[PDB]
């Protein structure tokens, strides 16, 4: 058994982490006090769930997680929340004043003063691991801390844990969901500095989550709680293979091996179905064919884009619930005849399928209804480059006038890093075009 350490940076990372660990505990039968009745190996063990939870002599199951934020208001809710007993204080790390939506402020100014403390709190979790696989890093693109400090942490993690894999869950900025004006700057700056340090990053566009909450959950004005509980369902589907017995995506390395043939193009698109409102009185349960077909609907993707006009490099189907391989192949065959599924020439036109019999778990009193089967599709599509194009264009509009640049230079950043980061994104956009477009 090999351990995984989760790291949550900034407000978005912290609150999403709260939703994930709440869900993990429900899925593994762990109470808010940390106790786990079904666990018969008291104070130890090397079961599948032990990759995310350590065990104390008193029977408490403690997450292998670190929460870091440059100001304390968000992490103070964890310290006094429903799961206050779950984490111990060393795991919860807070500063006094945030990065004010400024990558340079979180990366250079404030990051330099707290980076060593974070690494040491991390080193203490690593010292408890017989075999550490790597890290799962949750953060926003747009936040000063989520962008600026995460990029610093990722650099140092590569220095202190070179052989270890690092995966990202990144929140892509959407104006519908409380964005700052400079978030395009922070997004490009942090993607440039983090690119060579991340093996596989799952981008979640808040626009997509927002619309799924309005459209499928019939929530007029989705809150962060609504958004995060939905995000945690997708995150749980992605990490379930690390926490339960299985044979697909059993270690972090397998994610890169199965989803990322070329290192720079390490942003798989996630699609989830079904999302059903809990307030919906009468509901008809969807089939394996129907939820699999929904994986090719843009309206169910974590990032809005059109895969029909890109090329696939890898596709993974992760089912949870009453699903048997027979029904999956039947649905796949049908969808092949009706959908535009173009793979790149140098890759097999295939699907790696994973089935976990336990149906998805839903937070009691939440917005999601219990369903008998669900699926998360991870596909590496060149179509996701549309999100880079949108972002790069907003960057271009402001940077042409140097709008707001003085805030970053004032924190010690050189203006050259803007063009350097942008040039890297231009190369990234070109890499996607070479891979998936025909002359």
């Amino acid at each position: 058994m090999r351990e995984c350490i989760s790291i949550h940076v900034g407000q978005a990372g912290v609150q999403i982490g709260n939703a994930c660990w709440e869900l993990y505990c429900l899925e593994h039968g762990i109470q808010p006090d940390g106790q786990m009745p079904s666990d018969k190996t008291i104070g130890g063990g090397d079961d599948s769930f032990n990759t995310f939870f350590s065990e104390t002599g008193a029977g408490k199951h403690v997450p292998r997680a670190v929460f870091v934020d440059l100001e304390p208001t968000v992490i103070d809710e964890v310290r006094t929340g429903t799961y206050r007993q779950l984490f111990h204080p060393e795991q919860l790390i807070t500063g006094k004043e945030d990065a004010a939506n400024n990558y340079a402020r979180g990366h250079y100014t404030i990051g330099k003063e707290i980076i060593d403390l974070v690494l040491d709190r991390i080193r203490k979790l690593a010292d408890q691991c017989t075999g550490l696989q790597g890290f799962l890093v949750f953060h926003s693109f747009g936040g000063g801390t989520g962008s600026g400090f995460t990029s610093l942490l990722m650099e140092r993690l590569s220095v202190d844990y070179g052989k270890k894999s690092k995966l990202e869950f990144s929140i892509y900025p959407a104006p519908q969901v409380s964005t700052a004006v400079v978030e395009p700057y922070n997004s490009i700056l942090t993607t440039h500095t983090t690119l060579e340090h991340s093996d596989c990053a799952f981008m979640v566009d808040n626009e997509a989550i927002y619309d799924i909450c309005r459209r499928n959950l019939d929530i007029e004005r989705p809150t962060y709680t609504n958004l995060n509980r939905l995000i945690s369902q997708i995150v749980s589907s992605i990490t379930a293979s690390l926490r339960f017995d299985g044979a697909l995506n059993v270690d972090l390395t397998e994610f890169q091996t199965n989803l990322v043939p070329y290192p720079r193009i390490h942003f798989p698109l996630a699609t989830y179905a079904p999302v059903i409102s809990a307030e919906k009185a009468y509901h008809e349960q969807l089939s394996v064919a129907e939820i699999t077909n929904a994986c090719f609907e843009p309206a169910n993707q974590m990032v809005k884009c059109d895969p029909r006009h890109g090329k696939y490099m890898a596709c993974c189907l992760l089912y949870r619930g009453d699903v048997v391989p027979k029904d999956v192949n039947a649905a796949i065959a049908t969808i092949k005849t009706k959908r535009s599924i173009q793979f790149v020439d140098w890759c097999p036109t295939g699907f790696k399928v994973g089935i976990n019999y336990q149906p998805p778990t839903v937070v009691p009193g939440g917005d999601l209804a219990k369903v008998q089967r669900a699926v998360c599709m991870l596909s590496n599509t060149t179509a996701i480059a549309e999100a880079w194009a949108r972002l790069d264009h907003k960057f271009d509009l402001m940077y042409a006038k140097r709008a707001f640049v003085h805030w970053y230079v004032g924190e010690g950043m050189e203006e050259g890093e803007f063009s350097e980061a942008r040039e890297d994104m231009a190369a990234l956009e070109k890499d996607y075009e070479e891979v998936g477009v025909d002359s």
């Binding site: 059109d306 029909r308 535009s340 949108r390």
Partner: protein, 333 residues
């Protein structure tokens, strides 16, 4: 108030659509780079579909179907018909793609079979610069494109003993309804068809630009070498004892519906974050047996002078105002 932007100043059709939108008093034009638009009249090349449909509170409509190039490129149209099971095909001339994958060997195989079989072996080469010849060696040496059987037996109008082609305008709205403008046009060659001189490309090429330049009896039979349906129908009745509808329009409607429905799953914006529509220009040939042949599909077509008003008004009513209501001339296929 609805808002729109213009990104193709060289579009004659949408310059009139733009003009009409202002006259309604409920549409306001924006700068070409303002993202807060409801309607985009986009550029022909590299239209940024990836930036559409991400503006909160705005329903956004664009006048081009992403992926429709598959149909509107001569090379890709040939591949689309061959590799599409819904097309496989009796109304598209035998065509081959030849690079300067390639189909050289496959093209010559059929070419040789026709040669020994005594059948007419005249082909025409073209690209997205036209050569008509019966010697394969001359065709390939000119490319160094698509090679396509040259219809040697075209229906010739009388008097004049002259060639022609038919242009049909087809509008596809955001719901993927297929609307055929009930007014077409024939581009007529003013030179008598000479089947023994492919060197002179004036009685063989139907383009209005070629007739207006090289043709010396240009405009003799009809104004601007353009004959409209009312006249063409009357001619078919007088000369052939049939109607335009029965002899030709049934086939045109079939061909239009086959092409657009074939590619619908790939370009439909039914469940997309933005919506699309597009005006297409279908070009057909008619042979002496009154069989209709598809020649090409143009994705940014111009309109006949006397038809701009009616058609462009039809675009606003069917394609635009259907998504943005304000305060039939089409045949629904």
């Amino acid at each position: 108030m609805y808002t729109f932007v213009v990104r193709d100043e060289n579009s004659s059709v949408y310059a009139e659509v733009s003009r009409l939108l202002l006259a309604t008093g409920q549409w306001k034009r924006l700068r070409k780079d303002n993202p807060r638009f409801n309607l985009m009249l986009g550029e022909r090349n590299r239209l940024p579909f990836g930036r559409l449909g991400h503006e909160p509170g705005l329903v956004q409509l664009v006048n081009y179907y992403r992926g429709a190039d598959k149909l509107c490129r001569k090379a890709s149209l040939v591949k689309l018909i061959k590799t599409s099971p819904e097309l496989s095909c009796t109304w598209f001339p035998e065509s081959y793609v030849i690079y300067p994958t390639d189909e050289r060997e496959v093209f010559l195989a059929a070419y040789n079979r026709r040669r020994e079989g005594r059948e007419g072996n005249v082909w025409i080469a073209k690209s997205s610069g036209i050569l008509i010849s019966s010697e394969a060696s001359e065709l390939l040496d000119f490319i160094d494109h698509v090679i396509q059987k040259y219809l040697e037996k075209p229906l010739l109008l009388e008097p004049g003993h002259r060639k022609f082609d038919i242009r049909s305008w087809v509008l596809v709205d955001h719901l993927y309804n297929i609307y055929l403008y009930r007014e077409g046009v024939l581009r007529t060659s003013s030179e008598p068809y000479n089947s023994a001189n492919f060197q002179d490309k004036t009685c063989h090429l139907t383009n209005h630009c070629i007739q207006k330049e090289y043709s010396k009896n240009y405009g003799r039979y009809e104004e601007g070498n353009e004959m409209f349906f009312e006249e063409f129908n009357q001619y078919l009745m007088d000369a052939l004892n049939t109607t335009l509808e029965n002899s030709i329009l049934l086939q045109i409607k079939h061909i239009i519906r086959s092409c657009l429905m074939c590619i619908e799953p790939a370009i439909s914006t039914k469940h997309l974050h933005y919506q699309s529509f597009q005006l297409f220009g279908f070009d057909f040939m008619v042979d002496e047996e009154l069989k209709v042949w598809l020649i090409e599909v143009n994705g940014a077509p111009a309109c006949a002078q006397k038809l701009y008003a009616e058609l462009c008004q039809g675009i606003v009513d069917v394609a635009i105002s259907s998504v943005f209501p304000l305060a039939s001339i089409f045949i629904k296929l």
